Design a protein around this nucleic acid. Sequence first.
DNA 1: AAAA
Length: 124
Amino acid sequence: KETAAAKFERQHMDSSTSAASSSNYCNQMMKSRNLTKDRCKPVNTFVHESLADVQAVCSQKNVACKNGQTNCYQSYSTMSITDCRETGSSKYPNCAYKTTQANKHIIVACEGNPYVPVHFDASV
DNA sequence: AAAA
């Protein structure tokens, strides 16, 4: 089904853009990546690297999750990510976001075997 | 921005 790994690529992976094409990159994406499903995922960051690179992060700098859980990993490098916040105009089903684009390290939670990304924690 |  909707696997964990699989859940990460849907929500958190857009390797099709080097970055947010526009400010709607977030209303177009969220919406579409089924994040607006049966709610407005309030905040979500899209990474713009490959998958093989993002998955790498699981063999990368191990850091704590904001959670306190221990399988997070920051990227040694720095990724292009588009961070998505909903705007105070978001009203489900009418999900509307504030695209913020940045180049930051990413921090993800790894999991499985293969140990791959399964939750996206931060960016720094 | 992660799930008996």
